[PDB]
Design a protein around this ligand. Structure first.
Ligand code: AOP
Length: 67
């Protein structure tokens, strides 16, 4: 019933923590996707899928939220 634009989903999670200093932004993928995910945006503007349940991921989010 709703948006007919594509939206990004994640089908795998990066296995090891990204360097924190290379990440500038994050977002969660749509709740419509089959998997929950954090996407980190790097300073080279790459987008990397990550597991929201991982400690390092939650730590990075808190840090990013902690401007
Ligand atoms: C709202 O329009 C929902 N529609 O679902 C159709 C099933 C696949 C949509 C891509």
């Amino acid at each position: 019933p709703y948006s007919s634009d594509t939206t990004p989903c994640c089908f795998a999670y990066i296995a090891r923590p990204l360097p924190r200093a290379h990440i500038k932004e994050y977002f969660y993928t749509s709740g419509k996707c089959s998997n929950p995910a954090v996407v980190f945006v790097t300073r080279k503007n790459r987008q990397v899928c990550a597991n929201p349940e991982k400690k390092w991921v939650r730590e990075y989010i808190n840090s990013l939220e902690m401007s």
